[PDB]
Design a protein around this motif. Structure first.
Motif, mmCIF file in Angstrom:
data_model
loop_
_atom_site.group_PDB
_atom_site.id
_atom_site.type_symbol
_atom_site.label_atom_id
_atom_site.label_comp_id
_atom_site.label_asym_id
_atom_site.label_seq_id
_atom_site.Cartn_x
_atom_site.Cartn_y
_atom_site.Cartn_z
ATOM 1 N N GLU A 197 0.828 -1.203 0.000
ATOM 2 C CA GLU A 197 0.000 0.000 0.000
ATOM 3 C C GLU A 197 0.866 1.259 0.000
ATOM 4 O O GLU A 197 0.478 2.287 -0.568
ATOM 5 C CB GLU A 197 -0.933 0.018 1.217
ATOM 6 C CG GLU A 197 -2.041 -1.030 1.194
ATOM 7 C CD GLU A 197 -3.079 -0.789 0.107
ATOM 8 O OE1 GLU A 197 -3.017 0.260 -0.567
ATOM 9 O OE2 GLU A 197 -3.965 -1.656 -0.069
ATOM 10 N N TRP A 255 1.407 1.575 -3.674
ATOM 11 C CA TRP A 255 0.179 1.840 -4.415
ATOM 12 C C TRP A 255 -0.381 3.234 -4.152
ATOM 13 O O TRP A 255 -0.998 3.836 -5.031
ATOM 14 C CB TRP A 255 -0.890 0.788 -4.085
ATOM 15 C CG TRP A 255 -0.531 -0.608 -4.523
ATOM 16 C CD1 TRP A 255 0.231 -0.961 -5.603
ATOM 17 C CD2 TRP A 255 -0.965 -1.836 -3.921
ATOM 18 N NE1 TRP A 255 0.297 -2.330 -5.711
ATOM 19 C CE2 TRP A 255 -0.428 -2.893 -4.692
ATOM 20 C CE3 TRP A 255 -1.757 -2.146 -2.806
ATOM 21 C CZ2 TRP A 255 -0.657 -4.240 -4.384
ATOM 22 C CZ3 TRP A 255 -1.986 -3.486 -2.498
ATOM 23 C CH2 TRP A 255 -1.436 -4.516 -3.287
ATOM 24 N N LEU A 256 -0.158 3.749 -2.948
ATOM 25 C CA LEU A 256 -0.649 5.073 -2.577
ATOM 26 C C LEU A 256 0.418 6.167 -2.682
ATOM 27 O O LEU A 256 0.135 7.335 -2.437
ATOM 28 C CB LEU A 256 -1.216 5.043 -1.150
ATOM 29 C CG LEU A 256 -2.505 4.243 -0.913
ATOM 30 C CD1 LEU A 256 -2.828 4.200 0.579
ATOM 31 C CD2 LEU A 256 -3.654 4.884 -1.683
ATOM 32 N N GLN A 257 1.640 5.790 -3.047
ATOM 33 C CA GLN A 257 2.734 6.754 -3.165
ATOM 34 C C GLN A 257 2.905 7.580 -1.890
ATOM 35 O O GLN A 257 3.030 8.804 -1.939
ATOM 36 C CB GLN A 257 2.495 7.697 -4.351
ATOM 37 C CG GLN A 257 2.773 7.078 -5.716
ATOM 38 C CD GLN A 257 2.594 8.072 -6.856
ATOM 39 O OE1 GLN A 257 2.994 7.811 -7.989
ATOM 40 N NE2 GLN A 257 1.984 9.215 -6.560
ATOM 41 N N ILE A 258 2.912 6.901 -0.751
ATOM 42 C CA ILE A 258 3.063 7.565 0.540
ATOM 43 C C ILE A 258 4.438 8.210 0.674
ATOM 44 O O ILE A 258 5.457 7.581 0.383
ATOM 45 C CB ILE A 258 2.884 6.554 1.696
ATOM 46 C CG1 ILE A 258 1.507 5.891 1.600
ATOM 47 C CG2 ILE A 258 3.070 7.254 3.029
ATOM 48 C CD1 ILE A 258 0.346 6.865 1.649
ATOM 49 N N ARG A 288 -9.486 13.772 -0.704
ATOM 50 C CA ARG A 288 -9.244 12.395 -1.106
ATOM 51 C C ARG A 288 -8.062 11.810 -0.336
ATOM 52 O O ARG A 288 -8.131 10.691 0.169
ATOM 53 C CB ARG A 288 -8.953 12.340 -2.608
ATOM 54 C CG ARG A 288 -8.459 10.990 -3.103
ATOM 55 C CD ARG A 288 -7.359 11.184 -4.130
ATOM 56 N NE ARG A 288 -6.225 11.905 -3.557
ATOM 57 C CZ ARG A 288 -5.208 12.389 -4.262
ATOM 58 N NH1 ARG A 288 -5.177 12.232 -5.579
ATOM 59 N NH2 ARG A 288 -4.223 13.036 -3.649
ATOM 60 N N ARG A 289 -6.983 12.581 -0.241
ATOM 61 C CA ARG A 289 -5.782 12.127 0.449
ATOM 62 C C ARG A 289 -6.036 11.755 1.906
ATOM 63 O O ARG A 289 -5.621 10.684 2.356
ATOM 64 C CB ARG A 289 -4.689 13.197 0.373
ATOM 65 C CG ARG A 289 -3.290 12.670 0.709
ATOM 66 C CD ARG A 289 -2.899 11.515 -0.211
ATOM 67 N NE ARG A 289 -1.529 11.058 0.013
ATOM 68 C CZ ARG A 289 -0.951 10.070 -0.665
ATOM 69 N NH1 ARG A 289 -1.620 9.427 -1.612
ATOM 70 N NH2 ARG A 289 0.301 9.725 -0.402
ATOM 71 N N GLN A 324 -7.842 8.542 2.025
ATOM 72 C CA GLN A 324 -6.931 7.437 1.743
ATOM 73 C C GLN A 324 -6.045 7.073 2.928
ATOM 74 O O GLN A 324 -5.939 5.908 3.300
ATOM 75 C CB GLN A 324 -6.029 7.774 0.558
ATOM 76 C CG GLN A 324 -6.756 8.018 -0.743
ATOM 77 C CD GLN A 324 -5.795 8.228 -1.891
ATOM 78 O OE1 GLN A 324 -4.944 9.121 -1.850
ATOM 79 N NE2 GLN A 324 -5.919 7.405 -2.921
ATOM 80 N N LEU A 325 -5.394 8.070 3.510
ATOM 81 C CA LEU A 325 -4.507 7.813 4.632
ATOM 82 C C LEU A 325 -5.220 7.271 5.868
ATOM 83 O O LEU A 325 -4.678 6.411 6.558
ATOM 84 C CB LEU A 325 -3.719 9.076 4.989
ATOM 85 C CG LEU A 325 -2.880 9.708 3.869
ATOM 86 C CD1 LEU A 325 -1.845 10.641 4.495
ATOM 87 C CD2 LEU A 325 -2.178 8.627 3.048
ATOM 88 N N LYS A 344 -7.826 5.497 5.808
ATOM 89 C CA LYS A 344 -8.201 4.134 5.459
ATOM 90 C C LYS A 344 -6.974 3.251 5.673
ATOM 91 O O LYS A 344 -7.073 2.142 6.194
ATOM 92 C CB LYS A 344 -8.647 4.051 3.998
ATOM 93 C CG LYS A 344 -10.118 4.354 3.769
ATOM 94 C CD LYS A 344 -10.991 3.291 4.415
ATOM 95 C CE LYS A 344 -12.460 3.521 4.112
ATOM 96 N NZ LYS A 344 -13.314 2.437 4.669
ATOM 97 N N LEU A 345 -5.812 3.752 5.269
ATOM 98 C CA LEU A 345 -4.580 2.990 5.438
ATOM 99 C C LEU A 345 -4.313 2.782 6.926
ATOM 100 O O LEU A 345 -4.005 1.675 7.358
ATOM 101 C CB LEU A 345 -3.404 3.719 4.785
ATOM 102 C CG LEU A 345 -2.011 3.106 4.969
ATOM 103 C CD1 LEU A 345 -1.987 1.675 4.438
ATOM 104 C CD2 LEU A 345 -0.986 3.974 4.253
#
Ligand SMILES: C[C@]12CCC(=O)C[C@@H]1CC[C@@H]1[C@@H]2CC[C@]2(C)[C@@H](O)CC[C@@H]12
Ligand SMILES: O=C(O)Cc1cc(I)c(Oc2ccc(O)c(I)c2)c(I)c1
Length: 250
Positions: free
Chosen positions: A125, A128-131, A186-187, A190-191, A193-194
């Motif tokens: 992840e 995939w999420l480019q953290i 959105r970010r 996403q975070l 959720k991670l």
């Protein structure tokens, strides 16, 4: 951007920690798990020093400081491991320590293959999420404040305030690169959720280590002092529902 807060997180980030595993001897369930347990003990020392150096942490009641560390260490360590694995081996293997890297064979030999799968998935992840390193750092700090007793801490008010501020810091980090107001929302989604995805993985590991501790003598797996104490006193509070993770999403 680059606030005092970020300077701090980057400055206190723990360095490399070895497991002390003997990679010359053929793999065995007992040796692999004993080394993982020793790694956990070693990492715990670093986590404690790291947490006491976090902005505002020392303001929490001393009993709450020890409590949050005792409840959140698994998630914190798994999250950091997922990051190490992504940056070091592109999630190809689980990079627990330079001297303890798990390929598929070890994931199997360790008898916790499914759990390793979820952990490798978490590692992916990050790609995939480019953290970013900064996002990772702030999320990890927030993980320390992501699990508490259902009946609250000694001084919940202070904890609630501290957690709120760490969430705010993550906001700042996110807004520091999202010109458009849509990508910013959105970010965060996403975070969070991670971050939430870390809890189910930590719970499965809590369940596994608990069981392992119970039958540790029969399978010849060693548990260092602190690990055995925390897994028999604090972890059960989690597994019995007295202590629960704080999820962003339902
Ligand atoms: C947290 C550690 C050790 C530190 C790390 O890099 C993550 C990894 C996740 C699996 C844990 C392990 C510590 C020892 C445990 C808890 C074993 O008893 C079973 C699961 C292991
Ligand atoms: O401005 C920044 O980014 C730095 C910053 C970071 C944090 I986390 C923060 O939150 C608290 C809250 C209570 C408390 O006792 C302490 I010490 C800090 C504050 I105020 C400022």
């Amino acid at each position: 951007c680059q606030p005092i807060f970020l300077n701090v997180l980057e400055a206190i980030e723990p360095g490399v920690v070895c497991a002390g595993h003997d990679n010359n001897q053929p793999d065995s369930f007992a040796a692999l798990l004993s080394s993982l347990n020793e790694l956990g003990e070693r990492q715990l020392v670093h986590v404690v020093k790291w947490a006491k150096a976090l902005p505002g942490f020392r303001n929490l009641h001393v009993d709450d400081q020890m409590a949050v560390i005792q409840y959140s260490w698994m998630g914190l360590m798994v999250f950091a491991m997922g990051w190490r694995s992504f940056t070091n081996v592109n999630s190809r293997m689980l990079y627990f320590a330079p001297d303890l890297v798990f390929n598929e064979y070890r994931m199997h030999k360790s008898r916790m293959y499914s759990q390793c799968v979820r952990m490798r998935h978490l590692s992916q992840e990050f790609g995939w999420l480019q953290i970013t390193p900064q996002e990772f750092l702030c999320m990890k700090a927030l993980l320390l404040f992501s699990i508490i007793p259902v009946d609250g801490l000694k001084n919940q008010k202070f904890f609630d305030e501290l957690r709120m501020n760490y969430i705010k810091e993550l906001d700042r980090i996110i807004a520091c690169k999202r010109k458009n107001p849509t990508s910013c929302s959105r970010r965060f989604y996403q975070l969070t959720k991670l971050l939430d995805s870390v809890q189910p993985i930590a719970r499965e590991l809590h369940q596994f280590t608990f069981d392992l501790l119970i039958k540790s003598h029969m399978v010849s797996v060693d548990f260092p002092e602190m690990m055995a104490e925390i897994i028999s006193v604090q972890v059960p509070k989690i597994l019995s529902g007295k202590v629960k993770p704080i999820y962003f999403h339902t």
